């Protein structure tokens, strides 16, 4: 199901314009705000009591940056997402017990964040390509459950 050359182009062009210090934290922050049960995994992160607290929380932004880097990784290895995500899969599945449905949600949140930030540049074909990516990443990250 993976990307056509045209989709790869669309995806890399847009991703090149992404601020890697902000977008990851924006996505993680929104996950915590929009799907509040996810906060259960972040009891050590301090103040998450309001949308503003969550988005400006430095631990959230820091972790977000790491998440975005994994997506970047993923983008660079679309043909071996399983190997790329093995250690992360062990972590999130074997150690953390995160339900894999949450991997789908985070990926979709990231898609919403890209739409918010690129607006009309984030066309329906461009989103279609990105959905393949986030689906791929989610599936790979869930591998330890399969």
């Amino acid at each position: 199901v993976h990307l056509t050359p045209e989709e790869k182009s669309a995806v890399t062009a847009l991703w090149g314009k992404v601020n890697v210090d902000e977008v990851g934290g924006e996505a993680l922050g929104r996950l915590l705000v929009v799907y509040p049960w996810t906060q259960r995994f972040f009891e050590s992160f301090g103040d998450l009591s309001t949308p503003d607290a969550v988005m400006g929380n430095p631990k959230v932004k820091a972790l977000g940056k790491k998440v975005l880097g994994a997506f970047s990784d993923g983008l660079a290895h679309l043909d071996n997402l399983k190997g790329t995500f093995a250690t992360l899969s062990e972590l999130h599945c074997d150690k953390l017990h995160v339900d894999p449905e949450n991997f789908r949600l985070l990926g979709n949140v990231l898609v919403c964040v890209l739409a918010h930030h690129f607006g009309k540049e984030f066309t329906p074909p461009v989103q279609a390509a990105y959905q393949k990516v986030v689906a791929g990443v989610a599936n790979a990250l869930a591998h330890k459950y399969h």
Binding site: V33, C112, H116, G119, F122
Partner: peptide, 25 residues
């Protein structure tokens, strides 16, 4: 529902805050 959220996000940059994003969802 996801695609409606994406469409709103792409058209309403000022409105689509995290709080408004959650309400819409």
């Amino acid at each position: 529902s996801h695609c409606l959220l994406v469409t709103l996000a792409a058209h309403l940059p000022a409105e689509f805050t995290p709080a408004v994003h959650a309400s819409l969802d």
